[PDB]
Design a binder for this molecule. Structure first.
Ligand SMILES: CCCCCCCCCCS(=O)(=O)O
Ligand SMILES: CCCCCCCCCCS(=O)(=O)O
Ligand SMILES: [Zn+2]
Ligand SMILES: [Zn+2]
Ligand SMILES: [Zn+2]
Ligand SMILES: [Zn+2]
Lengths: 627, 627
């Protein structure tokens, strides 16, 4: 059978254990998440210009009765309900947030003549909807300044919902960002990350008790066009004190924590501390499972300590770009200390263990937070997990290899699987044993062993169905939203298979030219490039950049600021026009006839290079070997 | 039986295949490695001041007959003999190198009044011995300048063998380094890295056909005290043109390639290009298996391209801090192009594959260099490997997790092993099957499956002996020196068990104070720190630094430039005296009585904190679960 199964007796027991272990009696977050509520719109339904739906919350109604469901980890269910506390809120005098209109929050700070806005959600429609709610309740005011707290799409993505380029061009609107913002906002492993993200975000799952229920730092991500307008002003060095529209702001740069470009904000008049995405209502990711570079827990901890000693000590309210605020100086001091020691403990104790010989394959089964950190709701592994972050720290310092040469040169899973199956007496015998293990509630073992059979025999329905059943129990048990979604998406694909039916101008415009060509080098089909050699001078006059492109030894090189008198072709095109070509907004033929694409030398080389560029299928297999 | 076994028939066949696949007819390296030889001392034996032996080459005599040995990959054997071409060499007019006195080379450049020296080997005794050979053959000359090509111990370690602090202090000797040198020269995962390095370096193996034979970039690493004298001058930005003792030097910074602080050197008078450790006689590591952060192949490739377009185009000789030079402009241009496209192809094609859904557990079995790159001796995987570097690139962008939730929350190997064994019919049945697989030459499979049995039953001699036999065949087959050494060290420990019998003042002095306390936080025993809280102001007047130390929530924090009026204790000590304490060169009691260690507040806190500090056993288990 191919439909979700009820929670097993072992899964039920695991949920009861969560309740026994975690401080459910501490319900203060429920008060915090409702404090200062101005308006919760009755229903929320946000639409995109093309008619698609950007965001809606009606799919979460099953959570509203607040009744426990054993197919959901009760800690995650608690977070799931708190994230449904959406609408317009007062944080402090003249500081408001619209929460639950998208994954992130959007913050409106009262200036003398308009709003200073912090962040802009993921897509213009959600941002626009938030601004409309603000105007209905507080009165319409022009937005004078938009500040990006950091370089992530759930924060800069909806900017065109608030302001337009002509406002920025005229100086009516300023955009403030931490130094390094443009370099960090925008690729090379994009298809792999996006496809792996369908698991983490559970994009194929229904919203419900046996599907997606929450995304930890918010309900989920709004769907729509991605916008991005470049900053007009950057916060340099350690930070800067600015006055915006009569309001004093202190910006504290925290480079290389949750994002390479990030800054906390202190508002001294309100004694309000906006902790960007450094401190949120959950342990955050040191490693995002969809795939990204490992983050620096050591710096993350130190920057939280820096904020504590500078501001925390005088703060009356602390708030963030995800989740809800926390009021009271003693509460804020403790949250800052604990979040600082959370990242610090994860870092320090992973390394303490590693230095004792505990490997990347063992550390998550050994490392446990001490009670003082374990027993706070904002330290729970909803977004990041202690388990995956400990392995992340270890991977950052020691790498993927566990040091045991048995594992140094491993056969691909699909190549060793047939032998595992044979050694275990064949598929039927393996299933018999795995089913007995399943009946004992040993899901973490079952998913490892039955995965071998699925890889040996991807058309073995019985194997896929058992693997799916065990993964699903693990998803029900998961406190982590990303783990849950991944387990349930894996079950879904094992049961149903992968779909057989299957661009942002601003994002492309933000991409450095060198990175664009690095990406084109990634698209290069090695088979097509084999034995070829060509050099092309590329000139981009609007941005005043020159690149030397060299294809040789089945590799595309690009080099900024150099030209070769020996290149076989010289090509001139504005970066703006190159952008349009890639976005299919203009044809190369029309550009050549307009005199916008120019060439000397052999007119064919760039075309020949383009013809070697391959493509990537989005729906590649994950839970089985490639079809 | 517990002694090395002969190469199997499959291993022999694998060696013959290497010969069929690789260009052994290309023997030009043999001429290159002998070119400009001035003196090869008859025997080489270098001793340390305490009487220990730093370096000797007599253990490699078995290689001298040049006869093929099937327990050594013939490509590695070729490299092993070329690395035995040691002694004093002329590279170009007034440019000499002493090769094979240590892992790295040391370079002497004739100035008007003395030597400009590039790098200093690993330990003073080897450096001193190299200088003595130089003086015997070319005449004794003062060393006026020492340049560190980059921030690695096999390059700055022997500096005290050449110069002393009073020479630097008086300005008689200058030390030049790339900007960032001191930050990159010096920890947190040190015990784990060092212990894992016993495998990579094969520190327990004899020198011989069934032991250690070479270390790729050199024969091995000299053993002795580690020295380091701080630079007096840093090469800033992209680089700088300097004149040293009448000789013109162009320094090209290449930050974040083989080392975070590295610079190539162009010598325009001799048209000589010293490629630091960017281009050597082998594919280098993107990931060193002993464990370290993943290196940036993209930047590595671009920096090689930058050197090519700036200098390569006019170079007559190219040489490096490891291995031998290559003469002739056409040869140099090709080597630079190929090394550039080597790192570029590894990067680009790993990502091309990953974007198609190929995982970190599959990529090394899919990625292959094109013939133009595969068929050059300096592109062979002696130091780095295509296999481990491809997985490294993938790990850098996507992380350790393959995206399949079967693998998201894995049981530790020792906890799932008992079940693998049971499912496979028990130990005897598993061995029976594994022995048949062994008889078919399926070593990569045998080491994966028998490893399960060793982990289930670490005292099962029969299992350990088979695992050892299979690993050993893999070590014999390995072209990579680190892989070979690791496979043979694993066999050694399985057969014999781990030893049951078991500081650099300069290195400690080079360590930032914050990093020192970060390291102390890593030593913190969480059990001992539980429930404790303390704050200590630490003042270090000689360096003018203040730190706030806070222990809370089982985590030690240190914060530069802040002090707390609420700290329970204030401690004052020069960093120089703190160094001496840690090195056991002075007792804390003697320092307090000398007035060199001062305290206000509760005199006990720092002592209490120190008492919570744990230690790490060096010889932790790798190939079995912890004893
Ligand atoms: C349209 C893309 C939206 C991107 C929103 C996700 C934020 C990226 C950072 C990953 S993490 O969630 O901080 O761990
Ligand atoms: C006494 C320690 C000697 C360190 C020498 C090894 C160099 C460190 C860098 C690793 S790698 O060999 O570049 O990949
Ligand atoms: Zn973010
Ligand atoms: Zn965010
Ligand atoms: Zn090095
Ligand atoms: Zn080196």
């Amino acid at each position: 059978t191919t439909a979700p199964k009820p929670p097993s007796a072992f899964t039920v027991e695991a949920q009861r254990r969560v309740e026994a272990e975690l401080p459910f009696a501490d319900r203060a977050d429920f008060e915090r998440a409702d404090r200062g509520l101005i308006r919760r719109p009755e229903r929320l339904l946000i639409r995109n210009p093309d008619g698609s739906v950007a965001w809606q919350l009606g799919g979460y109604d099953f959570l509203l009765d607040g009744k426990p469901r054993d197919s959901i980890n009760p800690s995650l269910q608690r977070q799931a309900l708190l994230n449904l506390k959406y609408g317009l809120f007062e944080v402090a005098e003249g500081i408001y947030q619209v929460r639950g209109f998208d994954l992130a929050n959007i913050t409106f700070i009262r200036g003398d003549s308009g709003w200073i806005v912090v962040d802009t959600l993921t897509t213009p429609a959600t941002a626009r909807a938030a601004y409309e709610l603000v105007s209905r309740e507080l009165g319409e005011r022009p937005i004078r300044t938009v500040i990006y707290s950091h370089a992530h799409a759930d924060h800069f993505g909806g900017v065109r919902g608030l302001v337009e380029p002509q406002q920025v061009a005229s100086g009516a609107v300023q955009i403030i960002a931490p130094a390094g913002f443009m370099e960090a906002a925008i690729v090379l492993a994009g298809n792999a990350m996006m496809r792996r993200a369908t698991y983490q975000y559970g994009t194929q799952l229904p919203k419900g008790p046996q599907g997606q229920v929450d995304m930890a730092i918010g309900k989920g991500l709004a769907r729509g066009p991605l916008s991005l307008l470049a900053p007009t002003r950057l916060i340099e060095g350690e930070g800067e004190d600015l006055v915006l529209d009569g309001v004093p702001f202190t910006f504290q740069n925290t480079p290389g924590t949750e994002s390479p470009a990030e800054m906390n904000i202190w508002l001294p008049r309100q004694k309000a501390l906006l902790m960007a995405e450094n401190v949120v209502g959950t342990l955050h990711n040191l490693y995002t499972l969809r795939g990204a570079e490992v983050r620096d827990a050591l710096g993350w901890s130190k920057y939280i300590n820096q904020a504590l000693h500078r501001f925390g000590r005088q703060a009356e309210v602390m708030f963030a770009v995800h989740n809800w605020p926390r009021w009271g100086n003693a509460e804020i001091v403790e949250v800052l200390e604990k979040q600082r020691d959370l990242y610090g403990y994860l870092h320090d104790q992973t390394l303490h263990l590693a230095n004792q010989g505990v490997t990347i394959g063992q550390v998550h089964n050994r490392l446990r937070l001490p009670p003082s950190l374990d027993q706070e709701w904002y330290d729970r592994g909803y977004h990041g997990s202690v388990s995956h972050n400990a392995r992340a720290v270890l991977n950052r310092y020691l790498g993927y290899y566990d040091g045991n040469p048995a594992t140094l040169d491993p056969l691909s899973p699909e190549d060793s699987a047939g032998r595992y199956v044979e050694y275990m007496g064949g598929a039927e015998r393996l299933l018999e044993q795995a089913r007995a293990s399943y009946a004992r509630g040993e899901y973490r073992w079952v998913v490892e062993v039955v995965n071998r059979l699925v890889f040996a025999e991807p058309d073995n329905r019985a194997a896929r169905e058992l693997q799916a059943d065990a993964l699903e129990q693990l998803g029900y048990q998961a406190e982590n939203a990303g783990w849950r979604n991944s387990y349930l998406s894996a079950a879904y694909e094992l049961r149903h298979g992968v779909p057989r039916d299957q661009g942002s101008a601003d994002a492309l415009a933000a991409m450095d030219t060198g990175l664009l060509f690095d990406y084109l080098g990634v698209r290069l089909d090695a088979g097509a490039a084999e034995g070829k050699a060509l050099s092309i001078n590329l000139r981009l006059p609007d941005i005043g950049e020159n690149y030397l492109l060299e294809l040789k030894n089945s590799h595309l090189n690009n080099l900024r600021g150099v030209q070769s008198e020996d290149a076989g072709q010289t090509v001139s095109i504005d970066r703006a026009d190159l952008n349009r070509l890639l976005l299919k907004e203009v044809s190369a033929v029309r550009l050549v006839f307009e005199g916008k694409l120019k060439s000397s030398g052999n007119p064919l080389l760039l075309g020949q290079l383009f013809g070697m560029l391959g493509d990537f299928d989005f729906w590649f297999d994950i839970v089985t070997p490639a079809a």
